[PDB]
Symmetry: C5
Subunit: 206 residues, 5 copies
């Protein structure tokens, strides 16, 4: 465990071996989850990159938050993928927040505290329990077979993952930087492993 408050990872060079593995104390497969994180990059107008990858022993794209070039944000669960239109992108640190529910398939997507429309995706699906979380790289296998074109260059931090669906007030509290208590993945009790050219530097965002 490590209290990584006011600190973030740094991926300064485009490569295929720089990544960070996040360990989660999960035993029960998830019927709902909410992933909130913060990242900063300049490749939004050059190519596509991976933000948050989550793969199991059966699917390499179980939970993947991808950025599609000239399209926007790509949120996929269980292989199927929905798109969130982004007309104009700005060069600034952005805070994203994704949520999902199996009983209804509703997917919520929040950008800088402003929520987007609700869409249906994988109603009744069951997300596996054991997985390998990788930040900065998209995995097309179990913890390997990385990708120089789908890799991420920039900063990332404040990664928090719950096991239920957060309310709008709770998401606003997350965005405002208040107090919270994650249970699946906590930025204050992270169990991470660094492999490659990844440095830990103070965050640039307030």
């Amino acid at each position: 465990q490590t209290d990584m408050s006011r600190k973030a990872f740094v991926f300064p060079k485009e490569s295929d071996t720089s990544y960070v593995s996040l360990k989660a104390p999960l035993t029960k497969p998830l019927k709902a989850f909410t992933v909130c994180l913060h990242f900063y990059t300049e490749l939004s107008s050059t190519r596509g990159y991976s933000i948050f990858s989550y793969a199991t022993k059966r699917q390499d794209n179980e939970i993947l938050i991808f950025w599609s070039k000239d399209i926007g944000y790509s949120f996929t669960v269980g292989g199927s993928e929905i798109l969130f239109e982004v007309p104009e992108v700005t060069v600034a640190p952005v805070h994203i927040c994704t949520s999902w529910e199996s009983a209804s398939g509703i997917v919520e997507f929040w950008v800088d505290g402003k929520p987007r429309v609700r869409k249906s995706l994988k109603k009744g699906y069951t997300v596996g329990a054991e997985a390998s979380i990788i930040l900065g790289q998209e995995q097309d296998s179990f913890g390997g077979n990385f990708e120089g074109s789908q890799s991420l260059v920039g900063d990332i931090g404040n990664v928090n993952m719950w096991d239920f669906v957060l309310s709008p007030d709770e998401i606003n509290t997350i965005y405002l930087g208040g107090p919270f208590s994650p249970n699946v993945l906590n930025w204050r009790a992270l169990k991470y492993e660094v492999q490659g050219e990844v440095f830990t530097k103070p965050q640039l965002w307030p």
Copy 2:
């Protein structure tokens, strides 16, 4: 009766069977009405959709607030239709408020608290009392014959309908989220029926 405060309906998938029927304790035909609601959708730049439909045993488009593609908002009463120009539409939850009066035909249209110009429509007409209110679908019969192209995908809530014309101060109070007391259709005493893939989730708008 159900107190649906801080809660809204969810139409996540485009279909023709997802709808919600609103029951109203009306006995006298309306000589004036004021409909205030709140919705959120992304189809404003893709196609047209229905927002608030109100049909009787004689006219399927008695009171219909429609969104015309590349045109704007469409408010029709008794079959005749007037148009409200919308040059640029934004991706954000919007609060609309419509009012009508039979003695003078004046139609008031408010967007996010900002009022539009006053137009004449159906002077002296009489709106029927018994009706079938449907949210998310445009009806071209009495409570049926739905429409995959005129259906609505997104959220909707705060539906309030009076039996008279509201003042500008009252409409500003409605927009500010203060206290009010509807008499024909109250979001705090709604008598609704869900049929299809419609879920009740907390509202995204403040």
Copy 3:
């Protein structure tokens, strides 16, 4: 006399018979005047319309505040006309204020409290005393021969006319909605006559 505070006229339908005559207790011909009013319309991007007409037994366009299509505001006195450039027009209630002086010919034109440049028009001219004030229609005779293309569709109110030139501080007070005391045409002591399809409804502007 009628106290029409917080109330305005409504011209909802384009026609040639809807108008309102304003009576003024004037006996002396005016050597200077200041006309402040408020209106709201959507025809600024479709065609031209009349705002404030003032005609005598000799000239039908003695004092006329006209809106020229794709040009801007048209202020004419005694037949001669000057133009005020409007590059971009917005769909919103606007408050105009015009002033004139015979001893120097200076014409002041204020839009939403922001003053425009001062221009010369009819130095030494004398405006007649008896006249027929018409709102919503441009007259090309004495109180008649109306015009479906030069008519006005929308709301209008807060019409106040003095017999001298107002100061910038006084015009700012007028725009802020403070206290004042007109002497030629008072919105609080208006002597008006309605003929046609003109309704009196509460104002939309604050």
Copy 4:
């Protein structure tokens, strides 16, 4: 002497005989000066006009603040001219402030309190003492030979001229309308002479 506070000159008609001569109690030739004034006009997008002319018995353009069409502001001293780029001009009263120093040639140009870059012009030059200051007209002789195309149409006021270089804090105080004490040309002790169609009206700017 005349206290012209909260008052400004008016040039409403384009002509060649409307001008105002400003007398200055100067005896020593100036080694440095600072000219701050305020004007309002609409010809910024039509043609060029003169703002502040200052000529002696040897040079008609000794000190001239000119507006070049589709270029910007033109500040010239002793015949040589430098340019200040203006990409977009707005229709609003603007406050300009120019300063010069002979020992170093530095020229400071302030627009609405925002300073521009410093440029070199006429290092070591000596500005004459006796001169004829003319507002609204550019002179190409000593107090004559005016110019219908280089004339000015609009308002002008708050003309203040010192005999040294003002500091940034002093220029900010000038822009904020605080207290000051000019010595060469004071708007509170102006000694002016009106010849032509020039009227004294209250200022439009706050």
Copy 5:
């Protein structure tokens, strides 16, 4: 030593002999540095210019902050150069802040307090101790062989250089104009030498 607070250098004319040499009490070669300065110029849309040059007896571009025409800011260390994209440049005084670290190669670039993305440059390199700092001119030798096309025209000041990497809070304090204590190059204890047409005038920026 000289306390140059609220004062800045002036390069008003484009030439090749106007420059200022900054002396630094450095003995140990730098493993990390942070350079914060403030400048103002208008050549951002005309050509390229030099901002902060730092050369030793072996490399003329050891530390150079350059502005590339139609590209943006150019930060180079040890000969290798990285680019920071600038889509739109404005005519206003800007505050830049650069930092570097040899142990990790991370380069931080701050514009007006807003940080940019972190990039890798010269991991493990060692910057020499003795050097010749020149402001306004880019050197392609040791303190000579200047360049009329790479020279700088405008103002510059608040030059501060440390011997370590500053934190985001410290950089925000620098931008806010608070108290600080540099150790390699202090604007309050500068040891500078002027050669050419360079004047010391009060700063324009607040």
